[PDB]
Every structure is written in C-alpha cells, then in structure tokens.
C-alpha cells in the first residue's frame, strides 16, 4: 500500500496556516471502519512523535492547530497557524493493511 | 502500588452503615476512590458487575505480622494468610493480555512479594454468581432484592477489581480505573 | 504513559547483527504491540515489522524477508530486534514504536492499530 505526497517544500510564514496531504493506492476500509491512518512530526535530534492518533483524533500535547481530517483516502494535515517551533518533518501513516507504511515526509520550511 | 485516592469524602456510615467505595460525581462522571482501613464487622453489597472481588484483613496490614487475603474470580477463590505488606490502596488489576488474547487478572497491584508463609486454601467462587433486580449479598447470604437500599485481626480494607481502559498510550490518564462500587459496613 | 526506552549506538562489520532492546514502563509488554522502524537519509521512515493483535503474532515487512528477528522478554518488559542481513548500507536509526494491542469501548475492545509512542531510537550498523 502506497501513500502519495504533496510537494515536500511546504513553505512557512509563522502565524500563517499550512497544510500537507497524501492519498492511498489501496482501499482503507477496515473491517470495523476504523480507518487506521495517523500523522507524525519529527523535530531534529529526536524520533517522530505521533500528533494525530487517528484521522480526527488529536493527542494531548498537540495543539488544536492540528487536524488530520479527510475522506476518500485523501487526508490532509491542516495546521491552522504554523507557529514557532512547529517546524520539522511530517508524515502520514498507513496501518489499514497487513504491511504498514509511511509517506516520504514533507518539511515545513520557513 | 498506585496512589489512587480521593479527597473530602463525607462519612455517612454508622444507625445506617452505608458507604460508597467509588463515589461518582455528576461532574465529568468523576470517580472518587476511598477504600479506608476500617476496624474489624461484616459488610454487604449488590456487587454490580463483580467489581468487588475480595478483601484483606489483619492486625497491621503491614510487615512483621500476617494478614488474610481473600480474592474471587470466575473459576475459584483463593485465600492466603501471609506477611504481604501490601499496597495502601490495593486493587486487583485487570489487563489485556495480547499473546493469549484475553483479559487477565493480577495480584501484583495488591502486593509485591510476600514473606515466608504457609497458609493457602482454594474453593469454588462464592461472590461471582450474580444470577444474571440488585440481589444483595451479605457477609455469605445471597438473596434477591430490588433497589431499595434496605436489609490477630484489628482492621481491614476491601478489594475492587479495575478493568483498565485502553484509550491512548500517551499520558492523558493512567486508564487504570473503571466503574464504581459500594459496600455497606458495620457491626 | 508507555515511556519507550532505547539502547545506545553500536557499530559492527557486515553480516553481524546488532540486537536492539526496547524497554517499556507504565504498560507491560504484555499489553502492547511492538513495532520496529528503520530511518535513514535517502531512505526515509521504513516499517520493518511488528505485532498484529488480530492474529496475535509478529508480521514482518515484504522486504527484510528474513535474517530479521523480533522477540520479547516479557518477564523484564523488554523487547528485542536483530537484523543479520547487514551490508553496512543498512546503517540506520532504528526505532521501537508501540501502541495498545486493543482499545476499549465499554467491554468491546476490538483491535487497535497505531504507532503512538516512540523511543529515542538508536544508531546502529
Ligand atoms: C483464578 O485464580 C487462580 C489462582 O491464581 C488461577 O489458577 C492458576 O493458574 C495457573 C496457570 O494455569 C496454575 O499454575 C500451573 O499449575 C500446574 C499444576 O496444576 C503446573 O504444571 C503449571 O506449570 C503451572 O504452575 C495455578 O496452579 C492455578 N491455581 C489454582 C488455585 O488453580 C485461575 O486461572 C484464575 N481464574 C480466572 C478466571 O482468571
Ligand atoms: C503512595 O503510597 C505509599 C504507601 O503505599 C506512601 O508511602 C507514599 O508516600 C504515597 N505517595 C503519594 C504521592 O501519595
Ligand atoms: C492461555 O495460556 C495457557 C498457558 O498454559 C495456554 O495453554 C493456552 O493455550 C492459552 N490460550 C490462548 C488463547 O492462547
């Protein structure tokens, strides 16, 4: 299963909105409709951390600025405002199929 | 040992002996844990969903002496008397076991290791068959009843089982607790 | 709070495996799905394999067809991975990522998939 990517340059002006996205080469229909896709952010000097646990399920420590909403396999990670220190690599994940994958990784770039 | 406790809980038990181990507040459905050490009486409860599994009693509920641990589950009940030096707020943990693909119980949320002891006894469960309308069990008389809320060892605590939730792996909550329970206690 | 703990760096010559530990605390390994991921410049973030609760067994990636092995020291809450198929171009940061085996809705726990908690990772050849 393959995750596609929008341009990875994702230019940044702080205080302005930003978004990145991916689509799937294969159906995401999970037997329970769970649609297990998620989003991670990797800052330098550390592992990627998961920001959005599902599509719309955000985890504590991650501000309301972030959302993984989408449909039809097309999921967009929307950042309402990119603020200072929100810059690193961003990945969409895929756990709906036995093999699991990651996108290439976009980079927010000031 | 998990420090799972509440604050500012009123003492309504005597007169009437009623007491709630997990008080539930309307605000956020908050679960308030109070499993006090009581002087040693009998108790009774409706045992909703088999939350109450057992109880512990003895002179100090600490080391250099012994206490009695009685715990029920679906297949048997096991009683032991040992120098348990158990947790101040002991619980029977319930967790999901991924390799056996099932829920399992753990006594290591009650006590760590016991010191030298000899007494153990095993029998069929006496608390678990709820025949499914509250059906109160009094300490061991199990009778049908509706919801009317009517009719050395020095000290003790009760033991509740906690069905751990699985919400998020990150640190939003421990997820350790679930449900609510009560038992009415006295002479 | 899972708290994934990783081993330090280690460099070995081709064909030698490096066995990488993964210690957890707050949840025992018994409760968690363990997944391993490789990362490198020019390669990106790559899933190697991990535990799948529906079958309740470890599933390996379509690549890393073998000479890769994952195990669990459940008694010490420490998981391990090694790769003997080392050609040195496989030097990469390896990560242990975990997630709950299940989720809970009342008493219906379905199955849960995710890679929610990552350890620091280690650089190994
Ligand atoms: C309720 O609690 C009891 C007490 O822990 C659980 O039963 C215990 O299960 C273990 C594992 O199956 C038994 O250990 C094994 O014993 C055999 C000999 O009988 C030995 O060959 C094995 O190597 C191993 O040591 C343990 O004896 C058994 N205890 C008792 C009193 O039967 C029981 O499974 C729990 N029930 C539920 C529904 O959780
Ligand atoms: C937790 O309980 C132990 C006794 O079981 C006690 O010594 C310790 O001080 C308690 N810690 C907190 C934070 O309440
Ligand atoms: C549960 O564990 C026991 C340990 O002896 C094993 O025999 C049994 O097959 C296991 N059950 C499952 C569903 O794996």
Author numbering:
A (entry chain L): 2 to 27, 27A, 27B, 27C, 27D, 27E, 28 to 106
B (entry chain A): 15 to 28, 61 to 86, 90 to 181, 186 to 192, 205 to 216, 234 to 269
C (entry chain H): 1 to 52, 52A, 53 to 82, 82A, 82B, 82C, 83 to 100, 100A, ...
Sentences from the paper on this structure:
Most known monoclonal Abs (mAbs) against SARS-CoV-2 recognize one of three major epitope regions: the receptor-binding domain (RBD), the S2 subunit, and the N-terminal domain (NTD). TXG-0078 neutralizes SARS-CoV-2 and binds a diverse array of alpha- and beta-CoVs including OC43, HKU1, and 229E; however, TXG-0078 was unable to neutralize SARS-CoV or Omicron variants of SARS-CoV-2.
Our cryoelectron microscopy analysis of TXG-0078 in complex with the WA1 SARS-CoV-2 S-protein resulted in 2 different reconstructions of the spike-Fab complex (3.14 and 3.34 Å), displaying the conformational flexibility of the Fab-NTD region. XG-0078 binds the N3 and N5 loops of the NTD using all three heavy-chain complementarity-determining region (HCDR) loops. Both mAbs use a similar angle of approach, encode the same heavy-chain V-gene, and share binding interactions between the NTD and their HCDR1 and HCDR2 loops. Notably, TXG-0078 has a phenylalanine at position 96 on the HCDR3 instead of a threonine in 4A8, resulting in CH/π interactions with P251 on the NTD while also forming stabilizing contacts with Y27 on HCDR1. The proline at position 251 is conserved across all TXG-0078-reactive CoV spikes, WA1, Beta, Gamma, Kappa, OC43, and HKU1, allowing TXG-0078 to accommodate variability at other contact positions in a way that less broad NTD-specific mAbs cannot.
